[PDB]
Amino acid sequence: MISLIAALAVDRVIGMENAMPWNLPADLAWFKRNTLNKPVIMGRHTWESIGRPLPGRKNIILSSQPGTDDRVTWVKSVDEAIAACGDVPEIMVIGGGRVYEQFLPKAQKLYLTHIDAEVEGDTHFPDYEPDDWESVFSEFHDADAQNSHSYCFEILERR
Ligand SMILES: NC(=O)c1ccc[n+]([C@@H]2O[C@H](COP(=O)([O-])OP(=O)(O)OC[C@H]3O[C@@H](n4cnc5c(N)ncnc54)[C@H](OP(=O)(O)O)[C@@H]3O)[C@@H](O)[C@H]2O)c1
Ligand SMILES: Nc1nc(=O)c2nc(CNc3ccc(C(=O)N[C@@H](CCC(=O)O)C(=O)O)cc3)cnc2[nH]1
Ligand SMILES: [Mn+2]
Protein backbone atom coordinates (compact mmCIF):
# COMPACT_ATOMS: atom_id res chain seq x y z
CA MET A 1 0.00 0.00 0.00
CA ILE A 2 1.27 3.36 -1.08
CA SER A 3 0.55 6.59 0.74
CA LEU A 4 1.59 10.17 0.01
CA ILE A 5 2.42 12.55 2.85
CA ALA A 6 2.81 16.28 2.30
CA ALA A 7 2.23 19.73 3.76
CA LEU A 8 0.43 22.21 1.52
CA ALA A 9 0.22 25.98 1.88
CA VAL A 10 -2.28 28.09 -0.02
CA ASP A 11 -2.80 27.06 -3.66
CA ARG A 12 -1.05 23.73 -2.95
CA VAL A 13 2.40 25.31 -2.68
CA ILE A 14 4.83 22.82 -1.19
CA GLY A 15 8.24 24.37 -1.81
CA MET A 16 10.32 27.31 -2.95
CA GLU A 17 13.97 27.37 -3.90
CA ASN A 18 14.42 23.78 -2.69
CA ALA A 19 13.14 24.59 0.79
CA MET A 20 9.86 24.67 2.70
CA PRO A 21 9.11 28.33 3.51
CA TRP A 22 7.51 27.80 6.87
CA ASN A 23 8.52 26.39 10.23
CA LEU A 24 5.95 24.17 11.98
CA PRO A 25 7.49 21.89 14.59
CA ALA A 26 4.12 20.22 15.22
CA ASP A 27 3.81 19.31 11.54
CA LEU A 28 7.33 17.85 11.39
CA ALA A 29 6.39 15.83 14.48
CA TRP A 30 3.27 14.59 12.64
CA PHE A 31 5.44 13.69 9.65
CA LYS A 32 7.84 11.73 11.88
CA ARG A 33 4.88 9.98 13.64
CA ASN A 34 3.46 8.80 10.32
CA THR A 35 6.70 7.76 8.63
CA LEU A 36 8.85 6.26 11.40
CA ASN A 37 9.50 2.52 10.83
CA LYS A 38 8.22 2.71 7.23
CA PRO A 39 10.19 3.10 3.99
CA VAL A 40 10.19 6.66 2.64
CA ILE A 41 10.51 7.32 -1.08
CA MET A 42 11.72 10.75 -2.24
CA GLY A 43 13.07 12.46 -5.31
CA ARG A 44 16.63 13.68 -5.51
CA HIS A 45 15.80 17.38 -4.94
CA THR A 46 13.91 16.53 -1.75
CA TRP A 47 16.91 14.40 -0.68
CA GLU A 48 19.09 17.45 -1.32
CA SER A 49 16.70 19.71 0.57
CA ILE A 50 16.44 17.44 3.64
CA GLY A 51 20.20 17.21 3.47
CA ARG A 52 20.72 14.03 5.47
CA PRO A 53 19.03 10.66 6.07
CA LEU A 54 15.76 10.48 7.96
CA PRO A 55 16.65 8.07 10.77
CA GLY A 56 14.52 5.06 11.64
CA ARG A 57 13.19 4.77 8.05
CA LYS A 58 14.52 3.08 4.97
CA ASN A 59 15.33 6.09 2.74
CA ILE A 60 14.86 5.42 -1.00
CA ILE A 61 15.97 8.12 -3.43
CA LEU A 62 14.80 8.33 -7.03
CA SER A 63 17.36 9.57 -9.53
CA SER A 64 18.14 8.66 -13.11
CA GLN A 65 21.81 9.02 -12.21
CA PRO A 66 24.02 6.86 -10.05
CA GLY A 67 23.73 7.42 -6.31
CA THR A 68 26.06 9.53 -4.24
CA ASP A 69 25.56 8.29 -0.67
CA ASP A 70 25.37 4.66 0.49
CA ARG A 71 23.57 5.67 3.72
CA VAL A 72 20.37 5.55 1.61
CA THR A 73 19.11 3.40 -1.30
CA TRP A 74 19.10 4.74 -4.88
CA VAL A 75 16.66 3.61 -7.57
CA LYS A 76 15.89 4.59 -11.17
CA SER A 77 12.14 4.04 -11.60
CA VAL A 78 8.83 4.05 -9.74
CA ASP A 79 8.69 0.28 -10.10
CA GLU A 80 12.21 -0.12 -8.76
CA ALA A 81 11.48 2.24 -5.83
CA ILE A 82 8.41 0.20 -4.87
CA ALA A 83 10.29 -3.09 -5.11
CA ALA A 84 13.16 -1.72 -3.00
CA CYS A 85 10.66 -1.23 -0.15
CA GLY A 86 10.04 -4.93 0.02
CA ASP A 87 7.15 -6.59 1.82
CA VAL A 88 5.91 -3.85 4.17
CA PRO A 89 2.51 -2.75 5.39
CA GLU A 90 2.77 0.81 3.96
CA ILE A 91 5.16 2.75 1.76
CA MET A 92 5.37 6.51 2.43
CA VAL A 93 6.04 8.76 -0.56
CA ILE A 94 7.50 11.96 0.79
CA GLY A 95 7.78 14.06 -2.37
CA GLY A 96 8.64 16.35 -4.00
CA GLY A 97 6.21 17.64 -6.60
CA ARG A 98 7.45 15.48 -9.46
CA VAL A 99 7.52 12.35 -7.35
CA TYR A 100 4.06 13.02 -5.91
CA GLU A 101 2.66 13.27 -9.46
CA GLN A 102 4.00 9.86 -10.38
CA PHE A 103 2.84 8.08 -7.21
CA LEU A 104 -0.56 9.75 -6.88
CA PRO A 105 -2.37 7.28 -9.17
CA LYS A 106 -1.06 4.29 -7.16
CA ALA A 107 -1.79 5.90 -3.79
CA GLN A 108 -4.50 4.53 -1.52
CA LYS A 109 -4.07 7.15 1.19
CA LEU A 110 -3.02 10.82 1.51
CA TYR A 111 -1.71 12.41 4.69
CA LEU A 112 -2.10 16.14 4.02
CA THR A 113 -1.37 19.04 6.29
CA HIS A 114 -3.25 22.15 5.24
CA ILE A 115 -1.22 25.16 6.36
CA ASP A 116 -2.82 28.61 6.59
CA ALA A 117 0.09 30.46 4.99
CA GLU A 118 0.44 32.33 1.75
CA VAL A 119 3.74 31.70 0.19
CA GLU A 120 5.32 32.08 -3.12
CA GLY A 121 6.21 28.69 -4.50
CA ASP A 122 7.95 26.97 -7.31
CA THR A 123 6.57 23.49 -6.51
CA HIS A 124 3.03 22.30 -5.92
CA PHE A 125 1.25 19.20 -4.74
CA PRO A 126 -0.66 17.60 -7.64
CA ASP A 127 -4.00 19.06 -8.66
CA TYR A 128 -5.72 15.82 -7.70
CA GLU A 129 -9.37 14.91 -8.02
CA PRO A 130 -11.21 15.75 -4.77
CA ASP A 131 -14.24 13.57 -5.43
CA ASP A 132 -12.07 10.45 -5.40
CA TRP A 133 -10.89 10.84 -1.85
CA GLU A 134 -12.78 10.38 1.42
CA SER A 135 -11.69 12.42 4.39
CA VAL A 136 -11.39 9.99 7.29
CA PHE A 137 -9.54 12.15 9.81
CA SER A 138 -9.31 15.91 10.26
CA GLU A 139 -7.69 17.75 13.11
CA PHE A 140 -7.27 21.55 13.22
CA HIS A 141 -4.73 23.43 15.31
CA ASP A 142 -4.52 27.12 15.96
CA ALA A 143 -1.13 28.84 15.80
CA ASP A 144 0.84 29.01 19.04
CA ALA A 145 4.23 30.23 20.26
CA GLN A 146 5.94 27.30 18.54
CA ASN A 147 3.96 27.24 15.27
CA SER A 148 3.24 30.55 13.46
CA HIS A 149 0.40 29.36 11.29
CA SER A 150 -2.72 27.41 11.94
CA TYR A 151 -2.78 24.02 10.25
CA CYS A 152 -4.98 20.99 9.80
CA PHE A 153 -3.88 17.35 9.67
CA GLU A 154 -6.08 15.38 7.24
CA ILE A 155 -6.05 11.74 6.18
CA LEU A 156 -7.85 10.78 2.98
CA GLU A 157 -8.65 7.31 1.66
CA ARG A 158 -9.25 6.59 -1.99
CA ARG A 159 -13.02 5.90 -2.31
N1 LIG B 1 5.76 20.56 1.67
C1 LIG B 1 6.06 19.25 1.50
O1 LIG B 1 5.39 18.36 2.02
C2 LIG B 1 7.25 18.87 0.69
C3 LIG B 1 7.60 17.55 0.55
C4 LIG B 1 8.68 17.20 -0.22
C5 LIG B 1 9.40 18.17 -0.91
N2 LIG B 1 9.02 19.47 -0.80
C6 LIG B 1 9.68 20.50 -1.57
O2 LIG B 1 9.50 20.13 -2.99
C7 LIG B 1 10.66 20.64 -3.72
C8 LIG B 1 11.30 19.48 -4.42
O3 LIG B 1 10.37 18.92 -5.37
P1 LIG B 1 10.75 18.79 -6.92
O4 LIG B 1 9.45 18.48 -7.61
O5 LIG B 1 11.60 19.94 -7.36
O6 LIG B 1 11.72 17.51 -6.98
P2 LIG B 1 11.57 15.98 -6.46
O7 LIG B 1 10.27 15.39 -6.91
O8 LIG B 1 11.97 15.91 -5.02
O9 LIG B 1 12.82 15.35 -7.24
C9 LIG B 1 12.78 15.18 -8.67
C10 LIG B 1 13.95 14.36 -9.10
O10 LIG B 1 13.79 13.00 -8.66
C11 LIG B 1 14.24 12.10 -9.70
N3 LIG B 1 13.12 11.35 -10.19
C12 LIG B 1 11.80 11.57 -10.02
N4 LIG B 1 11.03 10.62 -10.58
C13 LIG B 1 11.92 9.75 -11.13
C14 LIG B 1 11.79 8.57 -11.86
N5 LIG B 1 10.54 8.01 -12.14
N6 LIG B 1 12.88 7.91 -12.23
C15 LIG B 1 14.10 8.42 -11.94
N7 LIG B 1 14.36 9.54 -11.27
C16 LIG B 1 13.25 10.20 -10.89
C17 LIG B 1 14.90 12.95 -10.72
O11 LIG B 1 16.31 13.06 -10.34
P3 LIG B 1 17.44 13.19 -11.45
O12 LIG B 1 17.44 14.61 -11.95
O13 LIG B 1 18.74 12.84 -10.70
O14 LIG B 1 17.13 12.15 -12.51
C18 LIG B 1 14.24 14.25 -10.54
O15 LIG B 1 14.77 15.39 -11.17
C19 LIG B 1 11.52 21.34 -2.70
O16 LIG B 1 11.16 22.72 -2.61
C20 LIG B 1 11.14 20.70 -1.42
O17 LIG B 1 11.45 21.50 -0.26
C21 LIG B 1 7.97 19.82 0.00
N1 LIG C 1 3.30 16.90 6.69
C1 LIG C 1 4.48 17.01 6.15
N2 LIG C 1 5.31 17.96 6.64
C2 LIG C 1 6.56 18.14 6.17
O1 LIG C 1 7.32 19.01 6.63
C3 LIG C 1 6.97 17.23 5.13
N3 LIG C 1 8.23 17.32 4.66
C4 LIG C 1 8.58 16.46 3.69
C5 LIG C 1 9.97 16.47 3.11
N4 LIG C 1 10.87 17.34 3.83
C6 LIG C 1 11.27 17.09 5.10
C7 LIG C 1 12.09 18.02 5.70
C8 LIG C 1 12.53 17.80 7.00
C9 LIG C 1 12.20 16.66 7.71
C10 LIG C 1 12.69 16.46 9.10
O2 LIG C 1 13.70 17.05 9.49
N5 LIG C 1 12.04 15.57 9.87
C11 LIG C 1 12.64 14.94 11.02
C12 LIG C 1 12.46 15.69 12.30
C13 LIG C 1 11.03 15.65 12.66
C14 LIG C 1 10.78 16.66 13.78
O3 LIG C 1 11.47 17.69 13.90
O4 LIG C 1 9.79 16.51 14.53
C15 LIG C 1 12.16 13.51 11.12
O5 LIG C 1 12.85 12.75 11.81
O6 LIG C 1 11.14 13.17 10.49
C16 LIG C 1 11.37 15.73 7.10
C17 LIG C 1 10.92 15.94 5.81
C18 LIG C 1 7.65 15.55 3.18
N6 LIG C 1 6.37 15.44 3.64
C19 LIG C 1 6.00 16.28 4.63
N7 LIG C 1 4.78 16.18 5.17
MN1 LIG D 1 -0.75 32.18 8.39
Ligand SMILES: [Mn+2]
Ligand atom coordinates in the same frame (compact mmCIF):
# COMPACT_ATOMS: atom_id res chain seq x y z
MN1 LIG E 1 -11.17 17.60 3.10
